[PDB]
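Follow-up to my post from last week.
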Amino acid sequence: PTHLSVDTKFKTEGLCVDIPGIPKDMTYRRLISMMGFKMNYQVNGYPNMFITREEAIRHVRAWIGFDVEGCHATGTNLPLQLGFSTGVNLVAVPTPLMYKGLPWNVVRIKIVQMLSDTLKNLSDRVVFVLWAHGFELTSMKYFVKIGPERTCCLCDRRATCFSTASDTYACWHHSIGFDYVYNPFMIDVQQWGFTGNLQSNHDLYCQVHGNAHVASCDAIMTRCLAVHECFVKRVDWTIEYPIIGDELKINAACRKVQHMVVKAALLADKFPVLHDIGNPKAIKCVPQADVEWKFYDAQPCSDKAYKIEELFYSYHSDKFTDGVCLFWNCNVDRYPANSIVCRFDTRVLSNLNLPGCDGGSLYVNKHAFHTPAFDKSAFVNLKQLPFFYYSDSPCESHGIDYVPLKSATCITRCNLGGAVCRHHANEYRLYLDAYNMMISAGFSLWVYKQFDTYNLWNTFT
Ligand SMILES: CC(=O)Nc1cccc(NC(N)=O)c1
Ligand SMILES: CC(=O)Nc1cccc(NC(N)=O)c1
Ligand SMILES: [Zn+2]
Ligand SMILES: [Zn+2]
Ligand SMILES: [Zn+2]
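User reply:
Got it. Predicted complex:
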């Protein structure tokens, strides 16, 4: 057992209002057959359209909530409303963005374009995330083809689309003009064992996604509940995720900014103790610094921000009021005034940051971190940390091509002396790039209000 056996049982109670009379005794094999697909006793990399929870979790970047509603109602084929967690609603006729009624042959083209544009920078596949009541599963034959695992007609990537026009296969990158989703995956969240309907289960955990009673709304709620179950209530930091973007540069930048900012604060205000609050694996980011370095363990909160009352009180320099507190992606309700803070802004648009549960976002960079909603009120005792570069390293090249650097924010012996040296200019520009990377990836930096870079100039005399 690595994949989901097609001979696994499927609970059909969810299905029986769109599909009256459905057998109680039902496997994936009989269900895939009922959906009009033929698995043609095939050992070719696609053993089941349906996947385990573990497989879905490994493919979270591929998740698209999908819901279909009998627009007209339950011989008599009537219009269907197709909703996706992208906020798209399509109406298919048999003849919160809301499109007029069109035949399947044009609806299927729009489905490929939408999935391709959403997923090409995210994933090698699609995982349709369902709260299955019947119409979603019986609609698939009209826009899905299955068969052996194939590759793109223009690259090495696995095929995700098929064209009836040209009888060829494409990935998400190369699918323009393709009309069928090829070898999609799917998970029915109702199989996980809930009481009561989607809204009632979704609304236990999340107040940000309403019900307009359109299909896209159920599609979003279904994916939200799935993220809640797999990344909020349950958490797995062993699971690794592929590089799809600037992960490595962002992580390098984060290390360089943390060392820079913490080193500068210790030099400027000479705190006798630093309280390092957060990752239990955390290492001294300024190993040479005089200070008393005291660590406090807190795993990433994935549900609600930690309450400062529980982190601190219940009895350590015990006095967290002594020296400075370092919260480096340790998300709390309200930072103390004597803090250095890095806080991920869940609202940022990137390929690393997926929509999450209850205003939170799912930040996927090597591991998946469901991050509680960014809240500006957490930072009331602090101010934004302005950009600066600080170095006491000697002015000395070794081994670029130069416009001489002029900057008020290049805090070096050489800038003090009137003229930035070439070494410090190269380092400044590398640091500014790293900084810009980290910010644009969605990290925000906050500091105690007395922090002033003017105090760093006298650390050279
Ligand atoms: C009760 C009812 O509408 N049934 C049904 C079943 C399958 C497809 C469709 N319609 C379609 N536009 O494909 C309708
Ligand atoms: C990168 C991100 O957004 N999340 C993250 C990463 C490492 C540690 C923590 N938090 C902790 N309290 O250990 C959170
Ligand atoms: Zn391709
Ligand atoms: Zn929600
Ligand atoms: Zn210099």
